[PDB]
């Protein structure tokens, strides 16, 4: 494990209810920074259908975290889903044998992988064409750098949810659905 | 399932505790004050959240030992009651064990 996957805000919206000195815009479906009347945070401002009891301005989940905010002048109910949070997991065959790796992102669709790792100088510049091919979507995230086959072998390196991976055959990393044993009657 | 969901809900509900500091929001600590005197408040919050994480992990280790004792018993019962016939009294049910 190397917990790295943090997607980043593209822009900021400091929308105010047709008032104090300014209002910016409303944005949907993308990873943004929001400050609705002093509510600084990072999220995805997708719309919703929650009846919101007109004096109320905030919404909370089970764990008292800010969930749905009304539009302050358009008066429409918008969810907060903070775009963040994966884990990078690294599949290697051992460095004495090869130096090529495969990378698992633990909980995402990787229609939306390619944006960012960002801490100090770790950076998008690996990623901008290393998405490419060899992208396989599992139920344990999605896996980059390994090629799916229809054979069924013994488990060598356990990815998860019934998927294992190995290194063989112009050698490469393969990923397969693991086999339980020899068939018998 | 109830113990696992209960421990996770306890761990996420302990993020709103101040532990004696003035706030539970980090930007309100970095606004409204100055950093050499906010430094002791964020050390108070970091030490409180670290003790919350450590006391989560300790009960997870104790419960994992309990589940491991139960799983070793289930592996013994599968080897001895399912894959064979047992002579041990009340190990595979009440009465003389058939299968």
């Amino acid at each position: 494990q190397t917990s790295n996957f943090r997607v980043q805000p593209t822009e900021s919206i400091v929308r105010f209810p047709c008032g104090p000195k300014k209002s910016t815009n409303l944005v949907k479906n993308k990873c943004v920074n929001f400050n609705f009347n002093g509510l600084k945070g990072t999220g995805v401002l997708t719309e919703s259908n929650k009846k919101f009891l007109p004096f109320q301005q905030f919404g909370r989940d089970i764990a008292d975290t800010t969930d749905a905010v009304r539009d302050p002048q358009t008066l429409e109910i918008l969810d907060i889903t903070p775009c963040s949070f994966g884990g990078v997991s690294v599949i290697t065959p051992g460095t004495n044998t090869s130096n090529q790796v495969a990378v698992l992102y633990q909980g995402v669709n990787c229609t939306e992988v390619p944006v960012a790792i960002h801490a100090d100088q770790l950076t998008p510049t690996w990623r901008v064409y290393s998405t490419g091919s060899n992208v396989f979507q599992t139920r344990a995230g999605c896996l980059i750098g390994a090629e799916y086959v229809n054979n069924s072998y013994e488990c060598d390196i356990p990815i998860g949810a019934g998927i294992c991976a190995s290194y063989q055959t112009s050698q490469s990393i393969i990923a397969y659905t693991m086999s339980l044993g020899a068939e018998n009657s | 399932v109830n113990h696992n969901a209960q421990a996770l809900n306890t761990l996420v509900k302990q993020l709103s505790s101040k532990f004696g500091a003035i706030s539970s929001v980090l930007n309100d600590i970095f606004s409204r004050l100055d950093p050499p005197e906010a430094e002791v408040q964020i050390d108070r919050l970091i030490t409180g959240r670290l003790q919350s994480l450590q006391t989560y992990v300790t009960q997870q280790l104790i419960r994992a030992a309990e589940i491991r004792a139960s799983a070793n018993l289930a592996a013994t019962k599968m080897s001895e009651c399912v894959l064979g016939q047992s002579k041990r009294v009340d190990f595979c049910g009440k009465g003389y064990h058939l299968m």
């Binding site: 989940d61 089970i62 764990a63 975290t65 | 399932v1 969901a5 809900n9 996420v12």
Partner: peptide, 30 residues
């Protein structure tokens, strides 16, 4: 009642179906 039932898409026995329905597993997103 213990052998697998080939009609259902999950090839489980009827007893395993009742054991799966009686254990009930959003707070997950929070």
């Amino acid at each position: 009642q213990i052998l697998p039932d080939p009609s259902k898409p999950s090839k489980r026995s009827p007893i395993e179906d009742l054991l799966f329905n009686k254990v009930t597993l959003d707070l997950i997103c929070a």
